[PDB]
Subunit: 221 residues, 2 copies
């Protein structure tokens, strides 16, 4: 079970394949997001799974309870390994999804991960939503809700993982993007369970070598 999830954010399937080619499922899982999915749909996800990768399908659903439950169900029936939803969607939405996934046809259940506050929201953006308090706080608040609602974990920065890991012992998955060569070891040590890594690998002159180096770094004893 590799701890690295490589973000594929190529705009075309030809470029995505070229980025995925030098990788190996022994060393990583793949994160596919809204760009590739909107352009190519479920069929591209199916191709990737047949190549032997587990897929974190990153569509950040945020809609009414029955729609999100229906969408997550579809993603689950696809065979997808991990998916995410906005905690902003509220308790009922989250609980409805959790309940819906218990009825899927696959024995192995997908991991359901919560999104808190995107790093792209600044102070005025938070105030637009009426959030008078600030990021570390509101994130910890949403994380607690996500847990209460039965989600398997949250996406969080490494700089947030140490804090949340104090709050949540296990099992609560901390999935952490924004890694740079916060380093892989630093993130894991803070409490991250999975590292989401993009350009350091995909824009490397030798992605395989880069991926191998991260794995070796993490496993250094």
């Amino acid at each position: 079970d590799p701890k690295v999830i490589v973000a594929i954010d190529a705009g075309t399937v030809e470029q995505a394949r070229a980025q995925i080619n030098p990788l190996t499922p022994e060393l990583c899982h793949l994160k596919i997001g809204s760009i590739l999915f909107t352009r190519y749909g479920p069929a591209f996800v199916e191709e990737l799974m047949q190549k032997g990768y587990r897929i974190f399908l990153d569509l950040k659903f945020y809609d009414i309870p029955q729609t999100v439950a229906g969408a997550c169900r579809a993603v689950a029936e696809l065979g997808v390994w991990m998916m995410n939803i906005h905690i902003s969607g509220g308790r009922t939405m989250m609980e409805t999804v959790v309940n819906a996934l218990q009825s899927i046809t696959l024995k192995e259940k997908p991991l359901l991960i919560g999104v808190t506050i995107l790093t792209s929201l600044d102070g005025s953006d938070l105030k637009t939503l009426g959030i008078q308090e600030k990021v570390p706080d509101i994130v910890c608040r949403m994380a607690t809700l996500a847990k209460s609602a039965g989600l398997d974990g949250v996406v969080c920065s490494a700089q947030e993982a140490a804090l949340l890991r104090k709050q949540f012992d296990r099992n609560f998955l901390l999935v952490t993007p924004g890694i740079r060569l916060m380093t892989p070891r630093a993130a894991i040590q803070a409490g991250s369970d999975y590292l989401v890594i993009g350009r350091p690998i995909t824009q490397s002159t030798d992605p395989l070598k880069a991926l191998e180096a991260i794995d070796k770094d993490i496993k250094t004893r």
Copy 2:
């Protein structure tokens, strides 16, 4: 231009086709949401467009600016008529999407509509996040910022349309679901709706085309 957008309720392709069969592109546009799109992808959207329909692709994007911009570009390239994004995503995200759509050398410009606070959420949800401000105040503010950022409009419930219309002239679209508390088509029109989003009143009627024709007249 029809003013009704019929919400396609269905789960399956065949069930979706059955709902759509009695309608006509002359009398309505279609709203296709995350369930249908996640299950069947762009190919099903293309099938409907080939049947002559304009599509409101309802995926409610809420991601970082470059991701939403890239997604909205895919949607535009697919030829979609209307799409939506979460205003919660921030000003930078909105402006980035707006600019990305401007740079596109497509012919017809796909309408970019903002989502405010879902009707599935209320003050009780907000307070759980330590938000003490009232929903209608947040909604009005979000709508205002959407307008400022260059979005073409917002989705607002029919129940909500009257108070919102008071804030915006007809340059800013109000796209209104929640039609049959109970808000008729007539009532939604009086309130200020620009597009009526209607599901079961049409799709579940013994004669969907009959009902649709009847609604197009009141307007």
